[PDB]
Amino acid sequence: LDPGLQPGQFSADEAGAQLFAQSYQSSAEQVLFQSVAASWAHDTNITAENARRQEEAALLSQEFAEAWGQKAKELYEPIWQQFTDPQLRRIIGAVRTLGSANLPLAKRQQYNALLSQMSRIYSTAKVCLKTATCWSLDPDLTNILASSRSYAMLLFAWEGWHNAAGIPLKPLYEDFTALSNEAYKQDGFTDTGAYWRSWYNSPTFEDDLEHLYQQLEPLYLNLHAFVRRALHRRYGDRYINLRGPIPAHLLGDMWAQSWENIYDMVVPFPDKPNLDVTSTMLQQGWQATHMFRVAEEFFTSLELSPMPPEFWEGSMLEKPADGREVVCHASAWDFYNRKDFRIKQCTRVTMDQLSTVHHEMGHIQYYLQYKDLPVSLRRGANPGFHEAIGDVLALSVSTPEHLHKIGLLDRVTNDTESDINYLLKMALEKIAFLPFGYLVDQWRWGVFSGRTPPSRYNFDWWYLRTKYQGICPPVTRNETHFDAGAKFHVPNVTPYIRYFVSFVLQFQFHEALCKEAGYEGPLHQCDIYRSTKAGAKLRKVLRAGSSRPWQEVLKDMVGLDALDAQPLLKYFQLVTQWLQEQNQQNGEVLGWPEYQWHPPLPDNYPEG
Ligand SMILES: O=C(N[C@@H](Cc1ccccc1)P(=O)(O)C[C@@H](Cc1cc(-c2ccccc2)no1)C(=O)N[C@@H](Cc1ccc(O)cc1)C(=O)O)OCc1ccccc1
Ligand SMILES: *[C@@H]1O[C@H](CO[C@@H]2O[C@@H](C)[C@@H](O)[C@@H](O)[C@@H]2O)[C@@H](O[C@@H]2O[C@H](CO)[C@@H](O[C@@H]3O[C@H](CO)[C@@H](O)[C@H](O)[C@@H]3O)[C@H](O)[C@H]2NC(C)=O)[C@H](O)[C@H]1NC(C)=O
Ligand SMILES: *[C@@H]1O[C@H](CO)[C@@H](O[C@@H]2O[C@H](CO)[C@@H](O)[C@H](O)[C@H]2NC(C)=O)[C@H](O)[C@H]1NC(C)=O
Ligand SMILES: *[C@@H]1O[C@H](CO[C@@H]2O[C@@H](C)[C@@H](O)[C@@H](O)[C@@H]2O)[C@@H](O)[C@H](O)[C@H]1NC(C)=O
Ligand SMILES: [Cl-]
Ligand SMILES: [Zn+2]
């Protein structure tokens, strides 16, 4: 570690702790920068030489983390918990927590190599059929899951991906879990999952989540039964069991996590205007550039910041056309130099991708708003806040009235049929996700705690997938398969519960900004576009970073200091009642009592 980057001396008391924290943050900025740059270089251009450089940057970050961490523990371990200043308790508390820097050198290198190899496997995995031709997840497999209605073709894509990504990840993921736990246990956590959960500073986190899910589950059950009936009408009594789980490949998405793509099959009133504007975007010839500019302009309408020149010059907004492998999974980047901020997204011209652009731009806007704070306060109030920002705007954007304003929809009527179509569409996107958003880290917490050893990785994954989502694998799986590994966030070792928290929080935010905007109608028809008052209220959250506990930031914004499902329920209320009525009238069974049921294979599986 460079002498400039090493800690000096400070007194062993709170006042010395303050100078320590100030000096730590000054040096951390340069270390953060080299790490992010090295990651960018790799993720936008996956090569062996780029991975090596990224691993060297990771090692440097660990050197830094060890030097300052050991210093924190040397001076403040017996006393920091009694420090009068809570903001200081949080920083010294962080710095004493070394993570992977607790590992000896050989194991650090092992750890960094594992993260690189898992990332490469997920992002370069292919499904091969000409016999030489192979499909990538993004865009090829994504498009198949989205627009193919051929049971056998969907199965080929689903099975191919899960096998390609999952099988070779398993041995690496076991090794990562052991090293991760080894590292965090030295910091005093029972396991890595306990550390991840501690970011929410709620002694009652898991219980709070379970109570939230209990209120939401009836909405999911009804949507599920309605959707399963729509699928049965298309795929027949052979492939769909009206009392069983839905086969996992028929919902529009590789993970059955958003059901927006099957909207045309489920839309209650097909003779109203088509609220999926994808085909209009194609007909009008929208490109990635347009999508990003349209998203930016919503942000500036609120008097939030435009994207800076560095963003437009540095960002990767389409999958490269040259012979280059990249991580296509979308992300938003802060380089920690208060100047460079970028999105990396393999943008496709679709309505859901337009919402995705807003999502990533929400992350950037957060970065732009808190860029002048001490480096340790450059985070969301909690990670769920960071995930909610862009989704909040996308809720206004997808309203039929807003789509009309941006030329994507001829004026729609204020009628009850159109409302049900819209709310059903929004349910496929938002309600359908909830079980998945909840289950992923239940699975991962069980793995980190040891309740789920490698011998039960897949058994427990599918237990959870069936329990919450009411889906089943369309082919037989066993413990050689590692289906959790075929989801980005697992091999990329980044937490998922933030998204469940985001989905509740975004409706709380939406309700608060709509009220602030002076809007008076139904919550699902609110468009905060051009509301500088809504913008000012959002800006206060963004500029706070993590300087204040999230419960207080939420209280100031929303009037409540806790996550609350009521705003989401309020938003969906009309379609919640409608689906319940329809399911009853149709004589549906809610849930999937035939829990053991799996679909048969197509007659000519796997060729076609
Ligand atoms: O860039 C990220 N995180 C990206 C993931 C990531 C994490 C670590 C390392 C590399 C990458 P993402 O969540 O933007 C990447 C986004 C991509 C995305 C968004 C949408 C979308 C669809 C419709 C409407 C709105 C959004 N569909 O895919 C993501 O994964 N989302 C989750 C879950 C999800 C989130 C929102 C949502 O609306 C739907 C789903 C997923 O795809 O599984 O982190 C920024 C940040 C977060 C928290 C604190 C600080 C910084
Ligand atoms: C789409 O249509 C709805 C429904 O509008 C209502 O019912 C129709 C059948 C007609 O009779 C309409 O004339 C009638 O308003 C609209 O919802 C309504 O919006 C209005 C205007 O913002 C709301 O009026 C306000 O009500 C609050 C009370 O909460 C007062 O404080 C205000 O002074 C103001 O009068 C009205 O409450 C609201 N109705 C309901 C049931 O929520 C909706 O605005 C419209 N949407 C669009 C985008 O055009
Ligand atoms: C992808 O990364 C590689 C490095 O892995 C880059 O290749 C280097 O490019 C510079 C200048 O173009 C050369 O001086 C080096 O000799 C190259 N290194 C190697 C190992 O070949 C490459 O430029 C990157 N590609 C893109 C499009 O950015
Ligand atoms: C697990 O399954 C592997 C491959 O899947 C199998 O082959 C396909 C075509 C179907 O027939 C499916 O039912 C089978 O599961 C097997 O090759 C492998 O032997 C199995 N692993 C273990 C440990 O038994
Ligand atoms: Cl999280
Ligand atoms: Zn995100």
DSSP per residue, 163-192:
IIIIHHHHHHHHHHHHHHHHHHHHTT-SSH
Judge whether 499 is annotated as a binding position: no
Instruction: Point out which residues pair with 316 in neighbouring strands.
Output: 344
471-472 and 134-136 beta bridge pairing: unpaired
- Is residue 483 a contact partner of residue 254, using CB atoms and an 8 Å limit? no
Crossing angle (nearest 10°) for helices 167-186 and 105-124: 150
- Is residue 225 a contact partner of residue 583, using CB atoms and an 8 Å limit? yes
Ligand nearest to the Cα of 380, by number: 1
Please give the Cα distance from 344 to 325 (Å, whole number). Answer: 13
- Is residue 360 a contact partner of residue 475, using CB atoms and an 8 Å limit? no
Deposited experimental method = X-ray
Centre of ligand 5 from the C-alpha of residue 135, in Å: 31
Judge whether 386 is annotated as a binding position: no
Is 581 a pocket residue for ligand 3 (Cβ < 6 Å)?
no
In a domain, 472, yes or no: yes
Cβ of 178: how many Cβ atoms within 10 Å?
13
Is it true that the peptide bond before 606 is cis, omega within 30 degrees of 0?
yes
Please give the Cα distance from 299 to 310 (Å, whole number). Answer: 17
Judge whether 359 is annotated as a binding position: yes
Ligand nearest to the Cα of 475, by number: 4
Centre of ligand 1 from the C-alpha of residue 75, in Å: 39
In three-state secondary structure terms, 218 is helix
Amino acid occupying residue 307: M
Ligand nearest to the Cα of 199, by number: 5
In a domain, 326, yes or no: yes
Centre of ligand 1 from the C-alpha of residue 593, in Å: 33
What's the sign of the alpha-carbon dihedral 395, 400, 404, 408? positive
DSSP secondary-structure letter at 466? I
The H or E element spanning position 56 is helix 48-76
Please give the Cα distance from 33 to 328 (Å, whole number). Answer: 22
Q: How many CA atoms lie within 13 A of 169 on its CB side?
A: 33
Is 190 a pocket residue for ligand 3 (Cβ < 6 Å)?
no
In three-state secondary structure terms, 471 is strand
DSSP secondary-structure letter at 316? B
Is 355 a pocket residue for ligand 1 (Cβ < 6 Å)?
yes
Question: Looking at ligand 2, which atom is closest to the CA of residue 522?
Answer: 42
Is 350 a pocket residue for ligand 3 (Cβ < 6 Å)?
no
Centre of ligand 3 from the C-alpha of residue 312, in Å: 22
DSSP secondary-structure letter at 217? H
- Is residue 441 a contact partner of residue 461, using CB atoms and an 8 Å limit? no
Give residues (CB < 6 A) around ligand 4: 476, 478, 480
Judge whether 387 is annotated as a binding position: yes
In a domain, 393, yes or no: yes
In a domain, 141, yes or no: yes
In a domain, 258, yes or no: yes
Please give the Cα distance from 467 to 436 (Å, whole number). Answer: 10
Contacts of 597 (CB under 8 A, 6+ apart): 241, 243, 244, 245, 472
Tokens, residue 292: 């990003």
- Is residue 359 a contact partner of residue 390, using CB atoms and an 8 Å limit? yes
Is 45 a pocket residue for ligand 3 (Cβ < 6 Å)?
yes
- Is residue 311 a contact partner of residue 343, using CB atoms and an 8 Å limit? yes
Please give the Cα distance from 173 to 151 (Å, whole number). Answer: 31
Is 187 a pocket residue for ligand 2 (Cβ < 6 Å)?
no
- Is residue 96 a contact partner of residue 72, using CB atoms and an 8 Å limit? yes
Centre of ligand 2 from the C-alpha of residue 583, in Å: 29
Of 217, 213, 221, which Cα lies nearest the Cα of 590?
221
Is 413 a pocket residue for ligand 2 (Cβ < 6 Å)?
no
In a domain, 595, yes or no: no
Please give the Cα distance from 327 to 120 (Å, whole number). Answer: 8
Ligand nearest to the Cα of 387, by number: 6
Residues recognised as catalytic = 360, 489
In a domain, 437, yes or no: yes
Is 401 a pocket residue for ligand 2 (Cβ < 6 Å)?
yes
Please give the Cα distance from 416 to 413 (Å, whole number). Answer: 9
Question: Looking at ligand 4, which atom is closest to the CA of residue 481?
Answer: 1
Mutate to test the pocket of ligand 3, among 40, 47, 316, 322 (most ligand atoms within 8 A of CB): 47
Is 47 a pocket residue for ligand 3 (Cβ < 6 Å)?
yes
Please give the Cα distance from 262 to 265 (Å, whole number). Answer: 6
Q: Radius of gyration of the chain from Cα atoms?
A: 24
Crossing angle (nearest 10°) for helices 205-235 and 433-449: 130
Cβ of 518: how many Cβ atoms within 10 Å?
9
Question: Distances from the Cα of 200 to the Cαs of 189, 381, 394, in angstroms?
Answer: 15, 9, 25
- Residue-range definition of the domain harbouring residue 103: 1-587
Q: Length of the chain in residues, anyone?
A: 608
Instruction: Quote the number of domains for the chain.
Output: 1
The H or E element spanning position 585 is helix 566-585
Crossing angle (nearest 10°) for helices 497-516 and 532-544: 140
- Is residue 176 a contact partner of residue 108, using CB atoms and an 8 Å limit? no
Please give the Cα distance from 42 to 35 (Å, whole number). Answer: 11
Centre of ligand 3 from the C-alpha of residue 44, in Å: 12
Instruction: Point out which residues pair with 126 in neighbouring strands.
Output: 136
- Documented resolution in Å: 1.9
471-472 and 246-247 beta bridge pairing: parallel
Question: Looking at ligand 2, which atom is closest to the CA of residue 414?
Answer: 1
In a domain, 599, yes or no: no
What's the sign of the alpha-carbon dihedral 71, 74, 75, 80? positive
The H or E element spanning position 134 is strand 134-136
Please give the Cα distance from 280 to 182 (Å, whole number). Answer: 53
Judge whether 510 is annotated as a binding position: no
